[PDB]
Amino acid sequence: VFYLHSRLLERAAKLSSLLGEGSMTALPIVETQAGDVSAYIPTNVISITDGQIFLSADLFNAGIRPAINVGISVSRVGSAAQIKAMKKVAGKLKLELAQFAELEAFAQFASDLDKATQNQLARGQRLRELLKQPQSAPLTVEEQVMTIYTGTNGYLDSLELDQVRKYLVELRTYVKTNKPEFQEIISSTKTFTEEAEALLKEAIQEQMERFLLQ
Amino acid sequence: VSRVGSAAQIKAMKKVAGKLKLELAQFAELEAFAQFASDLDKATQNQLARGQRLRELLKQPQSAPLTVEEQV
Amino acid sequence: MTLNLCVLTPNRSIWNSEVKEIILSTNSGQIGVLPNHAPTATAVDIGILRIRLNDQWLTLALMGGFARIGNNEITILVNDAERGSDIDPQEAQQTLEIAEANLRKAEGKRQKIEANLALRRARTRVEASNT
Amino acid sequence: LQPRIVGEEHYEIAQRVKETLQRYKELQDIIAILGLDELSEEDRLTVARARKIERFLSQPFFVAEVFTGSPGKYVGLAETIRGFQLILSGELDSLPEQAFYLVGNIDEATAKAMNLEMESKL
Amino acid sequence: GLTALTMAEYFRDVNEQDVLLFIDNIFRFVQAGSEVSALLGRMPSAVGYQPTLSTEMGSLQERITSTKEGSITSIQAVYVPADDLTDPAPATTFAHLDATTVLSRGLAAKGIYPAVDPLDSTSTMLQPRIVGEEHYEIAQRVKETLQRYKELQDIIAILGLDELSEEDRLTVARARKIERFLSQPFFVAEVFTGSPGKYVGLAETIRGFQLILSGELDSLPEQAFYLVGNIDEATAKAMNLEMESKL
Amino acid sequence: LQPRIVGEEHYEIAQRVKETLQRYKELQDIIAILGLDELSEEDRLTVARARKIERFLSQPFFVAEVFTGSPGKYVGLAETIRGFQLILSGELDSLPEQAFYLVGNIDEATAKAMNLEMES
Amino acid sequence: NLRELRDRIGSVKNTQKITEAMKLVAAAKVRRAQEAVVNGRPFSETLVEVLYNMNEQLQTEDVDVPLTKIRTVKKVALMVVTGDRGLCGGFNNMLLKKAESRIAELKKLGVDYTIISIGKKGNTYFIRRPEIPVDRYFDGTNLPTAKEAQAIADDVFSLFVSEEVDKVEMLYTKFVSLVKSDPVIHTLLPLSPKGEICDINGKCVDAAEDELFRLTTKEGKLTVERDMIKTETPAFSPILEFEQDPAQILDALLPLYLNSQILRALQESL
Amino acid sequence: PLQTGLIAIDAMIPVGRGQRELIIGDRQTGKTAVATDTILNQQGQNVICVYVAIGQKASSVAQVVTNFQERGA
Amino acid sequence: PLQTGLIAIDAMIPVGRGQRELIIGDRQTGKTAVATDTILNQQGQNVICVYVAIGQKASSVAQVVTNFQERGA
Ligand SMILES: Nc1ncnc2c1ncn2[C@@H]1O[C@H](COP(=O)(O)OP(=O)(O)OP(=O)(O)O)[C@@H](O)[C@H]1O
Ligand SMILES: Nc1ncnc2c1ncn2[C@@H]1O[C@H](COP(=O)(O)OP(=O)(O)OP(=O)(O)O)[C@@H](O)[C@H]1O
């Protein structure tokens, strides 16, 4: 079975320059029974593959959809396969999520923690609201950069824990309609530049004001 | 469990104890869960005491049968 | 000379300013302070403390204590104090009402003495509040 | 259980029910060790509501009469959605949890609360 | 693995060169032998490995020695399945291993490269009668300081670093100095970083930690020990940083 | 262990010892993490009685005298039932635990207790 | 079952995280309590200054005091200060046994013993017990900051003015060391003319034994350290003027000291 | 970069072109959900999607095929 | 007696001649160390010593026999 899976999986890889730079991403699926991820076929596919996107039913019931497990999931390709804008925002995003993952056991005690860890809990709490997505509604890289920037900079501390999703969807639509330079900038350069940073700050505060006047 | 239910009793024992198994299981919960709470409200405390009386009732010695009149 | 106002509750310093004109009551009755008010030691009753820096005299209540208005220092040790405008006159009157009602229920002796004290402390609250 | 198929109200109420039960189960062992007093207002609140919801998802069955003793109740989808909306919003947030046990509708649960309230007064 | 072994073994049996034999990784060779035995139809041992796990591991782990001619040093990766150190494959591999160096994501995420944790990593070679009493005592004091730092990790944040006693303030200070001096500019990571590669013998190492930990270089900035070769280059960088801080 | 065979007193004291040891076995999971401090008055009572009981069950043997050094005691039913009656009544509640460890009679337990109070 | 074992192990790990975080939370609360008592020191210290100025100026023969007169003990008011929370080791039980011993001693002397239950665990303990005499169950909900101190002050004032419950003694746990602390008994009433806290029978000066403890770390683990800098009052220019007779003025001053002592005791027990 | 359309994946678990990224989960955690999410994201850029169902319901294959039909992918 | 020469064993666990005793423990706890200790402590006593090594590392066996040659034991 290991020979089978190894041949089938390793048939898919990024070809060299002379052969045409063709490629073939294998996105296989294995289902794990009762969280026994160290079973035979799970450990086989985990050994052969590069990355593992681990899905958890306790997050799935808790509302956090897609229910990926961010502390367990890994990808040994890594930021090499990221847009420059995406990696610029993703570094800060990963650090913030690591922090809130450490502070997870301090949310009940949000009454007598120092205000700094209180605010880290607040940011991670909003960031959990950021990452949820509706069913089969995929985003573009530029809209995702919008969302991660709004989150990581600190522009959602004001709105309460639930409105964040509606606020962010309204943000994306307003930017799309009224500042069409951002998506063009990122489509051309694929780099988060200070001009698009200022443009996004402007659009963000505009949408925030009109949404708050609601 | 008993997959026959009240049809394995008589009308008298059914009238006296139709709901008793579900109420006794729910009271096993209520008495098992109210060890965490410090102070209880009076309704729950009285249900807990009655369930404990019920638990003392079901003790039966060896070689002792109870008739249907005594059971009812 | 020009004297300083550092009043203080048991745990902190309620008001640490250096203000001009200060008029607070006492056990004997009513007194006041002008800068360089002579060496004195007065146990202020449960009585409002109007406190006038140059423009404003906003009434700062208190539940009783002891003052020392001597050389360049006016320190008022108070068991509990709460300013005038800070307490709202409506709930202040509400406390006044329920306190008078408890004074009606003052049948016991120690109950009646504590009723008097709680009533008067709740009273000076309202006496500073709505003004 | 998808919005376009079941209606947005049915979907949102299903998601909220699952959320409160999952919060309860993720909290239950921490409570079992620690104690119940030491939880926040919203934590104790959701615990009470989730116990009540766990009661209200019970129902007397038409064929289980020999097992329960009560008569079976057919409960409609509108009645279910309404009752769970109420129990989740906290209208019934003072009724006995046991009033939510083996009841078909939500008016039956209110009437059973009335019966237990009178039984306590006697 | 046997192919790589014999190609290495020539290099020291005939040429008497100090060879390094990297095997990445041992667990997959173990399970490949398990698959071979499975296809051959021989009855399995415990939890699912081949019956000759010990003898098969020996056949590869006993050509790796230091003979009169040369020495093969085997730096092999190991993988623990189901987090077992007691699964037959990890147990048998550890029965052969002599020292383990453990790399942690913490030091990688922070920036102390290489990301070796000096506490999770251990050696059986760090006995006094093998390495010298001076090396042993300096290593012990360094481990004690770093461990006390891990113990104070939560305490200092709440208490404030000033409210600590003088001994514990000294401990956290020297612990930061030590943990930063553990960083090294690599010969092969200069292409990425830009810092020239450096080589530090044990003389430089033991004396550098003696100076840092003995309270003598306790007057240097934290950054003056970071990604530096030895204590001499540490002093050089410290003088640079102080001149750069004056003006 | 049935009254028709062993006498009602023997049977009753055996049931009470089994009861109390069961309750301590239950509370073991709690006390492992918490400690005895967090228990109720009746819970801590049962736990102290169970400690005394599970130590009073111990008896030095004649054939283990080479390992323990202590002369083995022979103690039959007339003293067994009485000693356990006393321990579960709680008259001996003032005694420590080590007084019941490695003794044959409840009298030897009490004498060891008097020694543990002679050594101030 | 493997699922069940993994579940129970995840449960124990959840418990480890919960309790490990509770440890840091309790340390932060200790730090805030320390930061509160150092700020509460000016009130009591300045009042001790002015109060020993009083027995230097009036030379101690001008006193006729409600809160100092000793009417022989006939009914006693023993104040039980108990922590509200739980899982705090045996801090509650230690003083809820000290009170049993102390009452079993003075129960033949002070025929009626009045327990004042300040806290929450005591309010459970005495209602579980068959009704020990309890005047006002003091518990904490926005009270413990200031309203609790003031309410204790009011209760002991009303109880002492009609002099039946004399010899008021409060029970608390001065946190001398972080690991060990035992419930002390300090006679608060009758208040002494000089500012010495009344020990057992009121005969011992406790100004030196009273200490303020602050957090630091002996080489291995964090531990409290006993820290004190205290002197005696100066004259403060006894030419000072009394607005009334110093008898009534000290009668109006003693409620302030009566308040401050109780507030600092409720910080020490906290 | 192969943009999957999920903020979480495209930020924290970056998938590339020629990378064998495994999706692993329990029953009904959304594995096929993330798969269709990616396939439907890749309308814009020029890739060919392949979906190999092994041992699934013909009704489930019918659902996913009809979905791609009404979506345009 | 079989004087093992170790303080703790000779105090608590007296090993006499003709008595089969077990040395059990984790990896790297000192079992071979105490073995070599006891064999070296039979230099005065008349007892000849035997040591077998079932599947031990060749470097370990070489170190053992080298120490025995060094002591002359
Ligand atoms: N990100 C999401 N947001 C909202 N709902 C989701 C999400 N992902 C999945 N769902 C819902 O969860 C249900 C299960 O999804 P899906 O069928 O993709 O899981 P699965 O892992 O393929 O299940 P199985 O393992 O049985 O094949 C779907 O009906 C879908 O409505
Ligand atoms: N009493 C001792 N004093 C100092 N060092 C010791 C002592 N005992 C053992 N050691 C050291 O500990 C290391 C392990 O010792 P030893 O070889 O006896 O363990 P082992 O049980 O044989 O290991 P394994 O179980 O892997 O065979 C050796 O390097 C040895 O130098």
Residue numbers in the entry:
A (entry chain B): 291 to 504
B (entry chain C): 364 to 435
C (entry chain e): 1 to 131
D (entry chain E): 375 to 496
E (entry chain D): 250 to 496
F (entry chain F): 375 to 494
G (entry chain g): 43 to 312
H (entry chain B), I (entry chain A): 146 to 218
Paper text:
ATP synthase is a molecular motor that converts energy from a membrane electrochemical potential into the high energy phosphate bonds in the ATP molecule, which is utilized throughout the cell to sustain its life by hydrolyzing ATP to ADP. Chloroplast ATP synthase (CF1FO) from higher plants has a unique redox switch that serves to modulate the ATP synthesis activity. The CF1FO enzyme actively synthesizes ATP in the reduced state, whereas the oxidized form has a low activity. Our cryo-EM reconstructions showed a complete view of the enzyme complexes, composed of α3β3δγεabb′c14 subunits, in different redox and rotary states.
We further focused the density refinement on the F1 domains, which have improved map resolutions from 3.0 to 4.4 Å. To test this idea, we aimed to fix the CF1FO in its active, reduced state in the native membrane by adding tentoxin after the enzyme was reduced before the enzyme was extracted from the membrane. Our resulting cryo-EM densities imaged after the addition of tentoxin were overall well-resolved, corroborating the highly mobile nature of the reduced CF1FO. Our structure of the reduced CF1FO reveals that the tentoxin binds specifically to the α-βT interface thereby blocking the most critical and rate limiting step in the rotary mechanism: the opening of the βT site and the release of the ATP molecule. All three rotary states of the active, reduced CF1FO showed the density of the bound tentoxin ligand, and its binding site alternates with the rotary state. Thus, in the three rotary states, the tentoxin-binding site is alternated together with the βT subunit, which indicates that tentoxin-binding indeed fixed each of the rotary state of the active, reduced enzyme. The percentage of the particle images of the reduced enzyme consisting of rotary state 2 (27.3%) and 3 (9.44%) are higher than in the oxidized enzyme (rotary state 2: 20.7%; rotary state 3: 5.26%). However, the reduced γ subunit does not maintain the β hairpin 1 structure due to the disconnection of the disulfide bond, and the β strands of the β hairpin 2 are shorter than those of the oxidized form. In the reduced form, the EDE motif does not seem to interact with the adjacent residues, allowing the residues between γVal247 and γAla250 to form a short one-turn helix. While in the reduced state, the βGlu412 is far from the γ coiled coil, which has less interaction with the central coiled coil and may result in less restriction for the central shaft rotation. On the other hand, the lower loop of the β hairpin 2 (γIle271 – γGlu285) has a low signal level (1.2 σ) in our cryo-EM density map of the reduced form, implying a high level of mobility.
